[PDB]
User: Fold regulator of G-protein signaling 3 from Mus musculus.
Amino acid sequence: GSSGSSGEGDPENGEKLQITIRRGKDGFGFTICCDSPVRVQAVDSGGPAERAGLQQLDTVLQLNERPVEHWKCVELAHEIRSCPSEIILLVWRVSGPSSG
Assistant:
């Protein structure tokens, strides 16, 4: 392959990024409510969720190393509240011009 190479195509844009939220302000900070699949509602400005690097408009894949693809706001909310200190939540984000 002097000029190019197979496979190169069909690249990967978005990637699985993990982010934790430190519950230390009127709750956790970020708000999430939906029906499996679960998604993000909105992020608080200047909070533990945002500062850490949590962006809204994302889909919750697995929480605290647990599958939540078929979980509902209630089902999940229960797991989150579990740890009043901090909790780990994984989501899928696309690094690009993604507007909104």
In short: Residues 1-100 form a domain with the Pdz3 Domain fold (CATH 2.30.42.10). The longest strand covers residues 15-22. The first helix runs from residue 48 to 52.
